[PDB]
Amino acid sequence: PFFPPLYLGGPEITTENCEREPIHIPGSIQPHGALLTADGHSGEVLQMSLNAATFLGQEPTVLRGQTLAALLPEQWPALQAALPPGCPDALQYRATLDWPAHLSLTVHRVGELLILEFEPTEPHALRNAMFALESAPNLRALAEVATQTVRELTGFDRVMLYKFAPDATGEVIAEARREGLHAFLGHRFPASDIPAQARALYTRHLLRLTADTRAAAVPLDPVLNPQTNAPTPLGGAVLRATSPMAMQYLRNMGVGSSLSVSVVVGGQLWGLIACHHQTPYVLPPDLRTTLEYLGRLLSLQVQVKEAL
Ligand SMILES: *C/C=C1/C(=C/c2[nH]c(/C=C3[NH+]=C(/C=C4\NC(=O)C(C=C)=C4C)C(C)=C\3CCC(=O)O)c(CCC(=O)O)c2C)NC(=O)[C@H]1C
């Protein structure tokens, strides 16, 4: 069972209990965006990331108790209709907000709570990218095409296809990398490097990232959902703070930015499209949506090719 989180008297995580870190409820976000939670009926703002002023122009204690009807009059009705009570928690409402300078708005529902993510935002290629994946004559060719295509889309210094063995050990079976980088191709890693609860989370929530592996997490306050007096589920929030233990591994690797997309075959975590940048790097929200779609196409092509 999960340890309590740090804000409920839980211990700091060590290599003795990697698998017990409740990574889905860090009660904090990454600083390149802002997060609000709001009542799924009233639209009352219940929780604020402490950096909410940077992106929304109001401090946490001023946003708290205001309604989305007031804060987002243009979107609040469509938001309500798009994410009704009982809808699946993977279902997203997406808008582009005009701000005095665009801001990408991503919302999902967890029970009676709306989770709002704000971050700055900036087809003939993508179609040939899809046909290129379809046209790979074997799994290795597919792996190479997938990593090259994602590297061209994103500009990431390294894109790997990280495949799980039945014992949950991991191997780099293909990679596209910048001139001068060490090869990881064929290198194998222990199961503990991506522990059991991360693997579980990655079967349901198919994309996660650390834009800056040195950035302190920004607290969500109040940290507990006032509805439940319990932690706010952030497994579906891309602005979710990353495991400190994971962040440290990346820093030691010389990685300033990390992003991965789940490859899911027959409802099991087959592997990851695993991306690194040496410098901190925010992949624009448009390019993430594209990478999500490519992971789903790649997941289907892997299932086929691997039967052969
Ligand atoms: C005692 C805890 C440990 C730990 C925890 C941990 N690791 C992750 C997530 C990831 N680890 C990855 C590992 C690798 N990336 C690479 O590039 C290579 C080798 C070339 C390896 C072995 C990957 C890809 C992930 C996924 C996230 C990402 O893409 O960066 C988590 C979950 C993090 C989160 O989602 O919040 C956790 C808790 N890792 C350890 O090594 C030990 C110390």
What does 188-232 look like in DSSP terms, one character per residue? Answer: EE-GGGS-HHHHHHHHHS-EEEES-TTPPPEEEESSEETTTTEE-
248 alpha carbon, distance to own chain's centre: 18
- H runs (alpha helix) in 72-160: 76-82, 124-135, 139-154
Tally of domains in the chain: 2
In this structure, are 44 and 159 located in the same domain? Answer: no
Q: How far apart are CA 93 and CA 114, in angstroms?
A: 10
Q: Which two tokens stand for residue 103?
A: 């801001």
* 126 phi/psi in degrees, rounded to 5: -55, -35
C-alpha distances in Å from residue 227, one per residue of 23, 55, 90, 175, 184? 21, 25, 21, 45, 46
Range of the domain at 295: 121-213+243-308
In this structure, are 200 and 157 located in the same domain? Answer: yes
In this structure, are 192 and 255 located in the same domain? Answer: yes
SS3 call for 283: coil
In this structure, are 47 and 63 located in the same domain? Answer: yes
The domain boundary, picked from 242, 262, 283, lies at: 242
Resolution rounded to one decimal, in angstroms: 1.9
Contact (CB, 8 A) for 208 and 196: no
Q: How far apart are CA 92 and CA 63, in angstroms?
A: 23
Beta strands in 80-145 (DSSP E): 93-97, 103-110, 113-120
In this structure, are 38 and 175 located in the same domain? Answer: no
In this structure, are 48 and 140 located in the same domain? Answer: no
Minimum CA distance residue for ligand 1 atom 17 = 274
β-bridge partners, 113: 39, 110
Give residue 73 CA to ligand 1 midpoint distance, Å. Answer: 40
CB atoms closer than 10 angstroms to residue 248: 11
Does 189 sit in the ligand 1 pocket, CB within 6 Å?
yes
In this structure, are 51 and 15 located in the same domain? Answer: yes
Contact (CB, 8 A) for 65 and 44: yes
In this structure, are 103 and 144 located in the same domain? Answer: no
Contact (CB, 8 A) for 118 and 35: yes
Minimum CA distance residue for ligand 1 atom 29 = 260
**298 membership: H or E segment, kind and range:** helix 285-307
Q: Give the strands of the sheet with 158-164, arranged side by side.
A: 188-189, 170-177, 158-164, 268-277, 257-265, 207-210
Query: Determination method here?
Result: X-ray
- The b/e string for 70-85 (b: 16+ C-beta within 10 A; e otherwise) is ebbeebbeebbebbee
In this structure, are 177 and 233 located in the same domain? Answer: no
Q: How far apart are CA 208 and CA 206, in angstroms?
A: 7
SS3 call for 2: coil
Contact (CB, 8 A) for 294 and 149: yes
Contact (CB, 8 A) for 133 and 141: no
In this structure, are 111 and 133 located in the same domain? Answer: no
DSSP-assigned letter for residue 47? E
CB atoms closer than 10 angstroms to residue 153: 17
Q: How far apart are CA 21 and CA 124, in angstroms?
A: 43
Indicate left, alpha or beta for 254 from its phi (over 0: left) and psi (-120 to 50: alpha). Answer: left
Minimum CA distance residue for ligand 1 atom 11 = 194
Cis peptide before 22 (omega within 30 of 0): no
5 Cβ neighbours under 8 A, 6+ residues apart: 22, 25, 26, 27, 231
Give residue 193 CA to ligand 1 midpoint distance, Å. Answer: 5
Half-sphere exposure of 283 (CA within 13 A, CB side): 30
In this structure, are 70 and 154 located in the same domain? Answer: no
In this structure, are 176 and 226 located in the same domain? Answer: no
Give residue 272 CA to ligand 1 midpoint distance, Å. Answer: 11
- What is the total residue count of the chain? 308
Residue whose token pair is 């979107």? 75
Contact (CB, 8 A) for 13 and 4: no
Contact (CB, 8 A) for 191 and 213: no
